[PDB]
Amino acid sequence: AALVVDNGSGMCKAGFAGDDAPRAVFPSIVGRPRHQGVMVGMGQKDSYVGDEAQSKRGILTLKYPIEHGIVTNWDDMEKIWHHTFYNELRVAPEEHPVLLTEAPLNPKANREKMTQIMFETFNTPAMYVAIQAVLSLYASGRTTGIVMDSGDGVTHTVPIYEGYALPHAILRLDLAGRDLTDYLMKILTERGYSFTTTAEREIVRDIKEKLCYVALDFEQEMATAASSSSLEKSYELPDGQVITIGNERFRCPEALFQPSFLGMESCGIHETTFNSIMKCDVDIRKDLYANTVLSGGTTMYPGIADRMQKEITALAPSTMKIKIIAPPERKYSVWIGGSILASLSTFQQMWISKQEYDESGPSIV
Amino acid sequence: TALVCDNGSGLVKAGFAGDDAPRAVFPSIVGRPRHQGVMVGMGQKDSYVGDEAQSKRGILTLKYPIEHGIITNWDDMEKIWHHTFYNELRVAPEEHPTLLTEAPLNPKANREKMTQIMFETFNVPAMYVAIQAVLSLYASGRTTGIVLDSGDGVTHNVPIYEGYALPHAIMRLDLAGRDLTDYLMKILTERGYSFVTTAEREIVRDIKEKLCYVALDFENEMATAASSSSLEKSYELPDGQVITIGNERFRCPETLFQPSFIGMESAGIHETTYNSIMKCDIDIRKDLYANNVMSGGTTMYPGIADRMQKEITALAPSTMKIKIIAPPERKYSVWIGGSILASLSTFQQMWITKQEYDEAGPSIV
Amino acid sequence: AALVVDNGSGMCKAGFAGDDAPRAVFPSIVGRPRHQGVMVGMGQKDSYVGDEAQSKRGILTLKYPIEHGIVTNWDDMEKIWHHTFYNELRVAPEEHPVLLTEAPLNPKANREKMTQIMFETFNTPAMYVAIQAVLSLYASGRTTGIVMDSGDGVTHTVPIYEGYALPHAILRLDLAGRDLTDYLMKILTERGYSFTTTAEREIVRDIKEKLCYVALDFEQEMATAASSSSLEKSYELPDGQVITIGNERFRCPEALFQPSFLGMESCGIHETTFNSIMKCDVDIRKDLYANTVLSGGTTMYPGIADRMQKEITALAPSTMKIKIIAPPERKYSVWIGGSILASLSTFQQMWISKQEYDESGPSIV
Prior knowledge:
The structure is cut from a larger assembly and holds two copies of chain A (365 residues) and one copy of chain B (365 residues). By secondary structure, chain A is α+β, with helices and mostly antiparallel strands. Chain A contains 13 helices and 19 strands. In chain A, a hairpin with a 5-residue loop joins strand 15 (233-236) and strand 16. In chain A, helix 4 packs across helix 12 (333-341) and helix 5 packs across helix 6 (201-211). Helix content of chain B is 35%, strand content 18%. Chain B is built from twelve helices and 18 strands. Chain B has helices spanning 50-55, 74-89, 108-120, 132-139, 177-192, 200-211, 218-226, 269-279, 285-290, 304-315, 333-342, 354-360, and strands at 3-7, 11-16, 24-27, 30-33, 48-49, 60-61, 66-67, 70-71, 98-102, 127-131, 145-150, 155-161, 164-165, 171-173, 233-235, 243-245, 292-295, 324-325.
């Protein structure tokens, strides 16, 4: 059984080619142990990593090795893979060929560097680096389409032709997760419910999931919220105030459609989609608009789809079926899609083996 | 007295006639605020064009009127030109005759709508629209030959016989300085970078201008990449983070021969010259083969002259004289070609005035 | 003239715009009358407040209205401003607009609640609230930069871009005035000095200011102390024998950079600053590094400036000109920066006017 390792920006997933949910999930953090000052004796292992490093925190330097999908730093990122094998799944990479995740808009030299380290340091038998969205469409049982990822800090719209992305049109936009959560922190500052970062920022995120949703129409939902009481939801504490949030709940998703709310320059998330599509192939265009699919943590807002289908209908030619495919498990779509892919025997007729590295080196993928 | 104003899909170049280099260079972007955004220090403002819209892009909804040489929107086009006159050139249109440029395939109606707007709103005494690349052959000082007009947003081949361009040979390729700017953006993201904040989404354009080359012998240069010598060339970013870009540097203009790098099944520049000179008449082929001139924003990259030299000598066999001519000016030749023509002592009898215009109507131009 | 009221957690500072140095400077305390028993009554002045309360003490429940730059109670605090007006500066705020200064990431509702009290209870014509640190960068003669404040209770490292604080990078670390001194007590006691709980905590504090500093390198300062008695400084008590403290004087301030001595899970005053800056915009960073400022009282240990320039240079890339500005007056800097802003009429056309509370209400902050 081979590996699927979904190093989402702050959170690595791992396991085997053929499972239904990721078999090792962890924060991609490397902890560098420290107290400065010429400490006479530090401890064991120069870097911690993962859920260890999370507990260990105050004695480590914690940082995500990854930024936006990109390996920022190869050293502490290598410690992430070193953890995956000989700590997380307790595996040996020399036996286990690894599918490796790569972001939308992620070429060239880390692929080139990745194949070096994994074939020399970790002596993988074979490997394949693979676009996160390109597998996300595979989890939804598809091949042509346009996938929209929004995780923690990134939207992503990838024009897929037949299991191939058309890279120029792949949009990345600076709107997701945090930009909605710190903004939701700024939504609970008119009333406002204190969290700031002392450090109940997490509880703000915790509201975001459990109590927020999408207004299908902003205006009628505004007046309806002003009609009070049913939209207001109590966010009680097992302690202090039975805090009430009302307008918030639809207010914070709305910054996806109107970048007015956050000051940021953007076309709507609907037009991000449009600005992958129209930048590409025309004979696939309602096969794109009818295989428009979602991926990631900030997609899961309850009501985005009804809102999206409408908001693209405001733009696209009348004569195209807007059909918003959001899967049930859209948090893990990449790993699932990768599991299916590395369950193809034809993934053998597809990845790069050891052989082709010892001949071609870096540029082989 | 006269004015010349050249409308790129990214940059507008205006000035007077007979000046060597443009007096107004401004970005074709028209931005509307997403709020009644009181700039504390000015009153309320309607539309920002170019540089103000470009410094304040954050608060706006940016849009380009000239998409791929063509004008898609005349509202924004008009306010651009009022801006060209009264603000940029600082002129009163009714005393200063104006010249403009157009796409090699520009529609009759488009030509007429720019002639409607120039007289009927602005009231200029005499206006001309000319045809982009053909004017670069006038900056190259000749009547006949084939011009590769490759810009910010459009690549073109134009063969002109004695004044008349022959459009069947006039090829076009909607992949240029823009598709390439963003193609630099992506190949650095996994080189190990995150062009995250806004000046980085622009410094990637700058690094394109500063470091790019169209390497001659691209293949063994791929082995030079693999042998990593001092082709590695660092650059300081808008902050101090020395980014070292070496290989992708040439491995990006390379896309002008092989659109497969970005995902087009279309042919490269060189072939598209050969096919042009081919669809053209056979005795004329010789002139075209001997007067092949590059112009525009993509052509600035070094070695592109050498490249088309050896490319078409490999494609077209061997009784022929080939000559590719690349001017030191080339990023403005479309304007320089207008300016000097406008001021020509034999050109006054092509200055189509209001007298001709009112009696004949738009169809005079 | 308008007002500036630096409610530093245990010590308020008040006065006007235009004045050099704080015009009312006082123990932020409001004492309720007490005694228990149950008896006849009490009668006059339901809260004696400011230094009146500080002399009173053992007759009033005095309390501290702020902790960690977070307001712990509003009733007592309201009476800090009321004392400020009709006792300290002897003023009535309906004539006199106020400027107020809070913590870097002073909790949302505390900002607003503050303003309510000032706008309906103390009816100010106007008020500008802002973060204590931003003002301190203006005192430091800067607009962009990062401030590393350490008062009595907590640090704060505030990446200010152009006179604006960025909350997502601003960190706050529980290492300050108390934590230094409580260690320093535990470390005098090795020689049996034992001031413990007489009254002499303020004397362990007097030692702190008057005799401590920060080792430049630690291990070579250790051997240098171990060559004896120029590093030691003798100390006469208010009543008591001359003591001698040597190894102490650097050992305790080192412990801002070193949590292991205190026995704590924390980053060092150098590194928290690094991790604050990285969370800021890649570009602005160059002159966050090149303008680290120090402010607050518990920075004041001699040697810290040469120490911290080196200490950030252990952590930051070589391509950015590290330059730690620490002002000689780093207690008053927040009222000074306060007075700078309060002497600037652009902020008159910008501060929260009563009418904007009549429009927006509590939300206006």
